[PDB]
Design an enzyme around this catalytic site. Structure first.
Site, short mmCIF file in Angstrom:
data_model
loop_
_atom_site.label_atom_id
_atom_site.label_comp_id
_atom_site.label_asym_id
_atom_site.label_seq_id
_atom_site.Cartn_x
_atom_site.Cartn_y
_atom_site.Cartn_z
N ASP A 139 -1.20 -26.27 -5.20
CA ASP A 139 -0.34 -27.01 -5.91
C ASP A 139 -0.32 -28.50 -5.38
O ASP A 139 0.67 -29.01 -5.05
CB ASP A 139 1.09 -26.46 -5.82
N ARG A 143 3.66 -35.36 -6.85
CA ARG A 143 5.16 -34.98 -6.47
C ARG A 143 5.33 -34.00 -5.19
O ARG A 143 6.36 -34.11 -4.35
CB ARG A 143 5.74 -34.00 -7.71
N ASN A 144 4.12 -33.40 -4.82
CA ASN A 144 3.82 -32.79 -3.48
C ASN A 144 3.37 -33.67 -2.46
O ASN A 144 2.51 -32.99 -1.34
CB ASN A 144 3.21 -31.60 -3.78
N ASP A 157 4.69 -29.09 0.09
CA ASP A 157 5.15 -27.91 -0.77
C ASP A 157 4.18 -26.87 -0.55
O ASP A 157 3.15 -27.01 -1.23
CB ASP A 157 5.16 -28.46 -2.14
#
Ligand SMILES: CCC(=O)Nc1cc(Nc2nccc(-c3cn(C)c4ccccc34)n2)c(OC)cc1N(C)CCN(C)C
Length: 311
Positions: A139, A143-144, A157
């Site tokens: 992932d 955003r992470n 994350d």
């Protein structure tokens, strides 16, 4: 290879919640300070509290605590400990500037080529460390990636992170909702996750930052993406990127997983580019932009605090 990582259990009276930062499906994350007793230090921390107290939500956050406690790298998020209250609390290093996606979106007029290439180097280093630990992220996205300072970012994350033992090469998942626009083709078709699929997601993350936070395949829903990548179509060349950088992204998006670059080579290439940034990224007004830094700030009596220096 025994995992001798240490899980630290924290007392609720050892940390104070200052304010709320965000709430949603995960729970609610607080900005706060951790004060270990008698040590005369404060540590800015993020405290994710997860209320209902569903058994699966517990199991998942304790899995995340396991993975986060088993990593130690300057470009991977720091796990400080967990509090075993009525609702389990997860305590990590506070990243004052938030996620990198929001940062590049709301600071695009002040972000130069040096910052972009340095972010690419640091993310490639963190991913290469995760590969050294034989850990697959599954992932990786803008955003992470959280921003400690404009000069320092860290991968985060690990809710989908999966460890492998020495001889094992692939991970097979089933029935889990997945970010399809960041995934490699083999992960979309057969749910196979390796470090090279992480390289594909790294290429999508680099494309995100180079476009200053634009959503990949903006108009297309998930269903077509698989066959679209089978047709040979990829994400377009961002306007600021020379062909040298877009070539790296394209190589990250190869169908043959072993033809994609490895994270060590990405470190090398983006390092070479970072030493002469404007030869490889053309940005209007690049030549003098200013990005902030700590001014010994925040709300009260912060005379005895730090975070990456608490060992
Ligand atoms: C996601 C949006 C965001 O990044 N919010 C944010 C986070 C941090 N710090 C931090 N550190 C470690 C973990 C986390 C974190 C981890 N999860 C999983 C989260 C979920 C929601 C919110 C935060 C987190 N957040 C911060 O520092 C004081 C300020 C902000 N803002 C006020 C935003 C600024 N606005 C202009 C963009």
């Amino acid at each position: 290879a025994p995992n001798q990582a240490l899980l630290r259990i924290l007392k609720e009276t050892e940390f104070k919640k200052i304010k709320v930062l965000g709430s949603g499906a995960f729970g609610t994350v607080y900005k706060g300070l951790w004060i270990p007793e008698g040590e005369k230090v404060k540590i800015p921390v993020a405290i994710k509290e997860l209320r209902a107290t569903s058994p699966k939500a517990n199991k998942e956050i304790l899995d995340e605590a396991y993975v986060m406690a088993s990593v130690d790298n300057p470009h991977v998020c720091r796990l400080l400990g967990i509090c075993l209250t009525s609702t389990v609390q997860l305590i990590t290093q506070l990243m004052p500037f938030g996620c990198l996606l929001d940062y590049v979106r709301e600071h695009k007029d002040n972000i130069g080529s040096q910052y972009l290439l340095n972010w690419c180097v640091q993310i490639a280093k963190g991913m290469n460390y995760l590969e050294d630990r034989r850990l697959v992220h599954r992932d990786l996205a803008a955003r992470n990636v959280l921003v400690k300072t404009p000069q320092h970012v860290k991968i985060t994350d690990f809710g989908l992170a999966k460890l492998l033992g020495a001889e094992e090469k692939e991970y097979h998942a089933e029935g889990g909702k997945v970010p399809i626009k960041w995934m490699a083709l083999e992960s979309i078709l057969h749910r196979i996750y390796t470090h090279q699929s992480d390289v594909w997601s790294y290429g999508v993350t680099v494309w995100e930052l180079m476009t200053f936070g634009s959503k990949p395949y903006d108009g297309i829903p998930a269903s077509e993406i698989s066959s679209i990548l089978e047709k040979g179509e990829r994400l377009p060349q961002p306007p600021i990127c020379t062909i040298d950088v877009y070539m790296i992204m394209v190589k990250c998006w190869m169908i043959d997983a072993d033809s994609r670059p490895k994270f060590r080579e990405l470190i090398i290439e983006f390092s070479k580019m970072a030493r002469d940034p404007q030869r490889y990224l053309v940005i209007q007004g690049d030549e003098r932009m200013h990005l902030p830094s700590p001014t010994d700030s925040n709300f009260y009596r912060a005379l005895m605090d730090e975070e990456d220096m608490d060992d």
